[PDB]
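Handout, section 4.2: multi-component inputs.
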Amino acid sequence: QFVSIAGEISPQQRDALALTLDSVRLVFVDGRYVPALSDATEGSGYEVSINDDRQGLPDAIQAEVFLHLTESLAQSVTHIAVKRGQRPAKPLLLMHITQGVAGEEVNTAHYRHHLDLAEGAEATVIEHFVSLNDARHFTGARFTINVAANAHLQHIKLAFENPLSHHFAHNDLLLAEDATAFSHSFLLGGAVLRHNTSTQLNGENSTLRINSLAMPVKNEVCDTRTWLEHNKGFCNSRQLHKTIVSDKGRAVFNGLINVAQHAIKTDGQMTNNNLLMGKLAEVDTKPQLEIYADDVKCSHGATVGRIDDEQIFYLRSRGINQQDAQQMIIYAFAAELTEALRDEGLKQQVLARIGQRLPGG
Amino acid sequence: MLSIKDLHVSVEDKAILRGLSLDVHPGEVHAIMGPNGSGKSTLSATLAGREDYEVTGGTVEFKGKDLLALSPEDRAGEGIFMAFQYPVEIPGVSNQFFLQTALNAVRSYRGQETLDRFDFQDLMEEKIALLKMPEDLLTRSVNVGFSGGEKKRNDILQMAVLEPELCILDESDSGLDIDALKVVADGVNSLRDGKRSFIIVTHYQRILDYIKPDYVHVLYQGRIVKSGDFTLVKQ
Amino acid sequence: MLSIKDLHVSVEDKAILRGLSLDVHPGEVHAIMGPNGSGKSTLSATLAGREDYEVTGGTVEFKGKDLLALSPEDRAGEGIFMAFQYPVEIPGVSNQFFLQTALNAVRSYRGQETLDRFDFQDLMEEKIALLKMPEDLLTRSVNVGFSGGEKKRNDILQMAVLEPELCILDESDSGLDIDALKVVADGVNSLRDGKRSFIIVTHYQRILDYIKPDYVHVLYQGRIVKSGDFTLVKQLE
Amino acid sequence: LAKGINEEVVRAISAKRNEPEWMLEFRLNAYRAWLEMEEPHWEKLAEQGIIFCSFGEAIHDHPELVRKYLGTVVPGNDNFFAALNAAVASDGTFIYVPKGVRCPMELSTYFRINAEKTGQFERTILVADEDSYVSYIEGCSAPVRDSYQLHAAVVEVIIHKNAEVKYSTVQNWFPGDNNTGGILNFVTKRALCEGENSKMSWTQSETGSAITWKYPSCILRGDNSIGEFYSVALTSGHQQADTGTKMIHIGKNTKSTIISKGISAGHSQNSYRGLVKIMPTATNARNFTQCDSMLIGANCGAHTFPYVECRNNSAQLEHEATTSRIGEDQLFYCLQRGISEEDAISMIVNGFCKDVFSELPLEFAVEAQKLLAISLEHSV
Ligand SMILES: [Hg+2]
Ligand SMILES: [Hg+2]
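Output:
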């Protein structure tokens, strides 16, 4: 049985868990926005409105049981808009802090946000999810996004909630003509975490990129899935999803690509590299291509394998200890994912989160 | 400095070594020869720490400690170094991040400390210079894109930086030539301070003309049945 | 006895060529030049049979019959060959299967029979050396792994095998150097028995020093506004 | 076969031969299994110990032989159609191969029949005991009725220590022009590598079915087992194919290869869907899968949904899939040098398919490429 009691926290708690970054930070607590702890958005270059107004929301691209429930159970909608050609100096940052309650009761929080990017705007937005403590929670999140002509998006989602939390999230990407969209998701937290990313290319000559890294530990299950529809032609899509599973953890990957008829010149590729480190670990991947146009080139490739024990032996024999050795190859493995983080400062804090689940720290 | 006694080792229950015994004192260079399959490749690996080695007999003690019970990471700190016959490529890891951590580790385990980055580059270049190495080693991925001769020569640069006490060369002469042979020699000899030691497990003998050994031992189906000095002949 | 008269052809509903006329007899070489965007590639393409060309009037007759009423597959048999400017890659298909098929097809048409093994083999070898092609040409897949320069010379080796009557070069010299140019010159010329006639659609003046043409026409506005001999290229300057 | 199917019909097909009761009841559980199930969505030589005789003759003269292998790998009840075939099936082929014997010739029964189609259901069971090498070929090439006919065969193969089985398949149907059009191919073929150092190698070219249902499997239970799979599938008109594979890895150091080439034309939809599974016992498994597709024209469909579930930390799996095509300019370049468009599309695909036809015996490969050629032209 689940209940939803929305408590309140202090600024001190925020600093100890907040990332070190100069941004426009909006804070949401137990599904509720807390103004006093958030930065103002007026004059930031970001138009922000919080209400229960749903007049604008697009219909869902792929309906499934948990989405209707969340939209319906969502306590508020975040209206965000960026006017034509505007390029904010600072990234928009949404940090999500969820907490559990004493007892056998399960605290639950649902976040709902919508972003509108007018023609030509290019901005970076980051989602950070963390647990205040060890108390369990059920986190819900939903991002619908409209990307107008010539716009460029850099979206990052960081689910760093505790090992005992449950994580179910859903972001949407809608692209217009001449659009560019880049998405990097780091699913690093929760007993069970499930992220789905659905995208629609409703405009010609567009570019899309979606990457993600999953690192499940002891008894946790992290399933990262994506859904992409190439409804129009002349679009190029690239996807890189990597997972690393240690000690009895479980990764699940799902990637559907649909290419509509007449959607000529589409170029979509998908790659999934999985690394197994525990003797009880599992990885399940199910890629799915649906192509209804011949003059196109779509392909996907996925690999699964273990750490090269010989380099590890090679590395250690010169003196590097087991924990640091194991750790060194993994940062190199995820390097291609971590390098897209243009901000060194942000990257190092992200690296710190990765390292703690390694056999170090 | 090194004492291996009545060593018996089997792998997948394979009886390989005949009961080999050897004594190495500080500041000495010893040369090891013999045919393939008599344990040469196994000896270095056994010394190095491969977990797939079932020890069916004997002991190996170093400075009064049982060496066979100590882990690989522990061996470098104490002063043991092995030049691999086939250096591994590690894509995505620069030499700089690797070596500094490795250096610190053995520095840590030896309980002294520590170089200064600023100092380290003046040291690297100088060593990078001794072996005519590419100025972009630090930025390159460990041995990636390197030829066999370059990968082998990289290990010698490695030796001077990690500063071991006992250097073991595991068939590192295979596939090389006189020119490359000339660079490795300047590196190894340069580590000779009359205290430091070297063990050369030869793939073949031509190598001994630039790095004169003081002692030579011959293996035959895993045992030394004859020992002597530099002066040696074939048939 | 190729005769082209007052030719009108359109591309994407736009009139480019507005009445070009030409007559070509056996053993003569004609050169067509001009700036990009004047019909050259379109002219070759029109002759070749590209489906995006609506012929709005005029005629093109060969050996006294209307060729335009004949299908694409039918024109090669009659003797028309085009060296492509951008040869297509056919992964998984060897030239041998390709050439034989190309060869049998034109052999079938004309009411003749399938050549005999040994000659096809004796002929290639002789020619494969002549055009500096990889000795392992026969087993590699058509143009796969070939540089821009390598794909271009190959269609000509093909030319020297499918036995066409009229060879058209549509800017197939692009990206080729002095070295590449001479072999191509040895390839086309070696087929000259006074039998075949040739039409060279120039990219640069380059070549007419190596393959001297007999008549020269410069196209502009989709019409021939000047014709002459080899000397004409130099004179307007 | 019709009219009808009941318990007595089963009891009637049995007893049409003096049939022992072991053969019979095997059908009944199947039939009973069929019942509980709902129906799912749309030259003369003397051996050398070898037995090469008919399926029916085998029960009668060699029951103990039959007794040891049937249902060992594909139970009656495994799924819907495999229950129905086991029961009800009279026709088929039996092969057992004895110690130390290299089959002198490659056994084949594919012949290019022009009599119309014999029978609706069958089951072949080939067993190669240790140190065996056998090549088996299966299929038929018949013109087809203006009724929906359902071909739902099941092939079981069991391979023991140091043995090798080579399995080929060439089925080709022709229903000009578009008719039904029209045959329902619902096959469940599976092979067990029992069976240290055992090696199984599926090869198949398939054409002209209305609906396909097929999961050629390799079961690597034995250590050092090796499975390979090469599959050519064409669809045209409004045909639909749904074919793939389930790979269960159990032994140590197992290696598997999957290469599929699916061609799609007109308004048809061909989908590859297969599975690679690695049990925790399956130490150092390695798989390389390849599923290439060529689509012809813009109004048809080709789909691909592979599944990989690995539960072992010594596995090494790589999976690639790639798309290719015939372009106008590619098409035009071929035509212009005098080869027809109809003949053009046939050439490129055969080149495209070269790497699979390679694994076929060369002779059946030639036959296979000429028929694919003509099945294209009629229908593309
Ligand atoms: Hg694809
Ligand atoms: Hg595929």
